[PDB]
């Protein structure tokens, strides 16, 4: 057989900063931007509690890719990234690494080696008007696929017709920016949903 010497005790050494940094502001928030103008926020110099979120189970979706949602309480990260926006009720599946869809190659796409979590919950009361919500904007026409974590801002006219779409600024040359419609008059799947993505 073989012989070893067993340990006697255990020690732990961690930094010495105590600030409840704004996880509330990202989640408790008044109004999020559109899908194609997703806002990026920095979280740093924190002592962040993660299981405190699990005491309020109102999020339909809580999935994590490269780490279990219970070991977050004894790990130290750097470059914590937060993205927040609101999309339709059936594009939630499209928010995943390596998917095929409109916003998959037009508005947002994660890399193939993601490390983080995605959270989605419903909001059909604070974000709906009986007259229809038309203040949420997204892109439908573009000839190229964007790379992950790339933002596009362009109000230019798509060259769509067979003729140069410079003097043809009306029909036959479509504007690439469309707006959604959100009402309390329709059923599931056609309602706004709030999405937060965390990158480590």
């Amino acid at each position: 057989s073989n012989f070893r010497v067993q340990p006697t005790e255990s020690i732990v050494r961690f930094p010495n900063i105590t600030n409840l940094c704004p996880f509330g502001e990202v989640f408790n928030a008044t109004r999020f931007a559109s899908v194609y103008a997703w806002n990026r926020k920095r979280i740093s110099n924190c002592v962040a509690d993660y299981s405190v979120l699990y005491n309020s189970a109102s999020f339909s979706t809580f999935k994590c890719y490269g780490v279990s949602p219970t070991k977050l309480n004894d790990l130290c990260f750097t470059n914590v990234y937060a993205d927040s926006f609101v999309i339709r009720g059936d594009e939630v599946r499209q928010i995943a690494p390596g998917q095929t869809g409109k916003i998959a190659d037009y508005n947002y796409k994660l890399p193939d080696d993601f490390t983080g979590c995605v959270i989605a919950w419903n909001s059909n009361n604070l974000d709906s008007k009986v007259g229809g919500n038309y203040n949420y904007l997204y892109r439908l026409f573009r000839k190229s696929n964007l790379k992950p974590f790339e933002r596009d801002i362009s109000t230019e006219i798509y060259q769509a017709g067979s003729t140069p779409c410079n003097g043809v600024e009306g029909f036959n040359c479509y504007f690439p920016l469309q707006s959604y419609g959100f009402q309390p008059t329709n059923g599931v799947g056609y309602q706004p949903y709030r999405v937060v993505v965390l990158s480590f």
């Binding site: 279990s68 070991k71 004894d74 790990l75």
Partner: protein, 50 residues
């Protein structure tokens, strides 16, 4: 040879053990085990031939 992934997500056991629950760590552990077994067998055969 102890610094090769062999297809797993890392090369250190303790990182996997501190990042994941067992149902996901089993596959990475298996891949590492297979690689190290192959290397050991090759070394032993060469030594006998010498």
């Amino acid at each position: 040879q102890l610094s090769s992934n062999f297809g797993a997500i890392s090369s250190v056991l303790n990182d996997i053990l501190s990042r994941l629950d067992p149902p996901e760590a089993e596959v990475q552990i298996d891949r590492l085990i297979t690689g190290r077994l192959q290397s050991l067998q090759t070394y032993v055969t060469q030594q006998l031939i010498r």
